[PDB]
Design an enzyme around this catalytic site. Structure first.
Site, PDB file in Angstrom:
ATOM      1  CG  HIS A  75      38.721  -1.423  40.229  1.00 28.76           C
ATOM      2  ND1 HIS A  75      39.094  -0.199  39.687  1.00 28.76           N
ATOM      3  CD2 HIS A  75      39.646  -2.304  39.825  1.00 28.76           C
ATOM      4  CE1 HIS A  75      40.166  -0.371  38.960  1.00 28.76           C
ATOM      5  NE2 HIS A  75      40.554  -1.636  38.999  1.00 28.76           N
ATOM      6  CG  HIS A 134      40.638   0.534  32.550  1.00 25.86           C
ATOM      7  ND1 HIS A 134      41.563  -0.347  32.995  1.00 25.86           N
ATOM      8  CD2 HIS A 134      40.270   1.283  33.659  1.00 25.86           C
ATOM      9  CE1 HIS A 134      41.748  -0.169  34.292  1.00 25.86           C
ATOM     10  NE2 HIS A 134      40.984   0.796  34.724  1.00 25.86           N
ATOM     11  CG  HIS A 164      40.377   5.304  34.575  1.00 27.11           C
ATOM     12  ND1 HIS A 164      41.702   5.058  34.308  1.00 27.11           N
ATOM     13  CD2 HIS A 164      40.336   5.977  35.763  1.00 27.11           C
ATOM     14  CE1 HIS A 164      42.461   5.539  35.299  1.00 27.11           C
ATOM     15  NE2 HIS A 164      41.686   6.106  36.184  1.00 27.11           N
ATOM     16  CG  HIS A 183      38.349   7.712  39.896  1.00 25.99           C
ATOM     17  ND1 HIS A 183      38.792   6.655  40.567  1.00 25.99           N
ATOM     18  CD2 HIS A 183      39.259   7.953  38.927  1.00 25.99           C
ATOM     19  CE1 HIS A 183      39.968   6.227  40.056  1.00 25.99           C
ATOM     20  NE2 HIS A 183      40.250   7.030  39.041  1.00 25.99           N
ATOM     21  CD  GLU A 204      40.410   8.660  42.636  1.00 28.63           C
ATOM     22  OE1 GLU A 204      41.269   8.720  41.703  1.00 28.63           O
ATOM     23  OE2 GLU A 204      40.407   7.738  43.458  1.00 28.63           O
ATOM     24  CG  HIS A 229      42.106   9.890  36.640  1.00 34.46           C
ATOM     25  ND1 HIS A 229      42.151   9.051  37.716  1.00 34.46           N
ATOM     26  CD2 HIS A 229      42.004  11.180  37.165  1.00 34.46           C
ATOM     27  CE1 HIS A 229      42.066   9.767  38.816  1.00 34.46           C
ATOM     28  NE2 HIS A 229      41.949  11.042  38.536  1.00 34.46           N
ATOM     29  CB  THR A 278      43.991   7.526  42.929  1.00 36.20           C
ATOM     30  OG1 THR A 278      43.186   6.921  41.866  1.00 36.20           O
ATOM     31  CG2 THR A 278      44.605   8.912  42.514  1.00 36.20           C
ATOM     32  CG  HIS A 279      43.301   2.005  41.766  1.00 38.31           C
ATOM     33  ND1 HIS A 279      44.023   0.972  41.220  1.00 38.31           N
ATOM     34  CD2 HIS A 279      42.606   2.611  40.777  1.00 38.31           C
ATOM     35  CE1 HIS A 279      43.736   0.987  39.908  1.00 38.31           C
ATOM     36  NE2 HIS A 279      42.915   1.959  39.596  1.00 38.31           N
TER      37      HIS A 279
HETATM   38 ZN   LIG Z   1      42.076   7.097  37.929  1.00 37.27          ZN
END
Ligand SMILES: [Zn+2]
Ligand SMILES: [Hg+2]
Ligand SMILES: [Hg+2]
Ligand SMILES: [Hg+2]
Ligand SMILES: [Hg+2]
Ligand SMILES: [Hg+2]
Length: 260
Positions: free
Chosen positions: A64, A67, A94, A96, A106, A119, A199-200
């Site tokens: 997804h 990293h 990482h 988004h 986000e 992040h 967030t996931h």
């Molecule tokens: Zn993140």
């Protein structure tokens, strides 16, 4: 495990609660930052980051997203100050992004969605034994968030993008060394902070968020490089990592504090 959560119309953000009921919790991230409603806290200290480049170790395609992992056996790379009394150990950074270059962050500010988000995550080494234990505790993790605005190319990102060619498909990994992620942060020391979550999935409410007041730039071709990685394993049909950004969630009465 046996995780079938993604960002598609069938396993996406609006379906997570079917499997992760905490998805509807009271301390869910990200959130929209209303600058008219933030509260100035004068006890907030200046955030201080002290990272050893020698601790960078690998880059991996997680399906997804991708990293950049750090060696977390020492306190060689840590974050202090801001709202914390202890030190947090760096373990990863990482990004988004969205399917469009204009709407992919986000967190939002005054209801405005930026183009992407960086992040830089850390865990509480002063209170827990490992990342694994802390991950689910309320003071377990601390994540620095930096909004990315589409514009001029960001030279600082080059090492990360050149690296991508070796992790095109899900599960590939490559040595990634001698790098200080502080080179990615904006000049400014001002920020917003609030208690939230991952967030996931697994969505734990274990993150104390640090949102930088200043954004950084990125260009459309830089973002298109992100979007070119694939979520399939090598040998299968090509499925592009088109987007990995979750929708903002209700504050449910939390307070966003500001350092200014
Ligand atoms: Zn993140
Ligand atoms: Hg920012
Ligand atoms: Hg900096
Ligand atoms: Hg800072
Ligand atoms: Hg910052
Ligand atoms: Hg900042």
């Amino acid at each position: 495990a046996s995780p079938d959560w993604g960002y598609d119309d069938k396993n996406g953000p609006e379906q997570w609660s079917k499997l992760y009921p905490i998805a509807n919790g009271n301390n869910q991230s990200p959130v929209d930052i209303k600058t008219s409603e933030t509260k100035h806290d004068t006890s907030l200290k200046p955030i201080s980051v002290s990272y050893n480049p020698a601790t960078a170790k690998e880059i991996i395609n997680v399906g997804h997203s991708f990293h950049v992992n750090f060696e977390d056996n020492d306190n060689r790379s840590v974050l202090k100050g801001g709202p914390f009394s202890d030190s947090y150990r760096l373990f990863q950074f990482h990004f988004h992004w969205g399917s469009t270059n204009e709407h992919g962050s986000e967190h939002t500010v005054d209801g405005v969605k930026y183009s992407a988000e960086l992040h830089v995550a850390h865990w509480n080494s002063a209170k827990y034994s490992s990342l694994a234990e802390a991950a689910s505790k309320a003071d377990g993790l601390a994540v620095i968030g930096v909004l990315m605005k589409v514009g001029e190319a960001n030279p600082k990102l080059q090492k990360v993008l050149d690296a991508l060619q070796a992790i095109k498909t899900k599960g590939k990994r490559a040595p990634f060394t001698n790098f200080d992620p502080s080179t990615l942060l904006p000049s400014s020391l001002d920020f917003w902070t609030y208690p939230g979550s991952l967030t996931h999935p697994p969505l734990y409410e274990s993150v104390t968020w640090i949102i930088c007041k200043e954004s950084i730039s990125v260009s459309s071709e830089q973002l298109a490089q992100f979007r070119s990685l694939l979520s399939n394993v090598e040998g299968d049909n090509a499925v592009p990592m088109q987007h990995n950004n979750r929708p903002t969630q209700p504050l449910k009465g939390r307070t966003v504090r500001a350092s200014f």
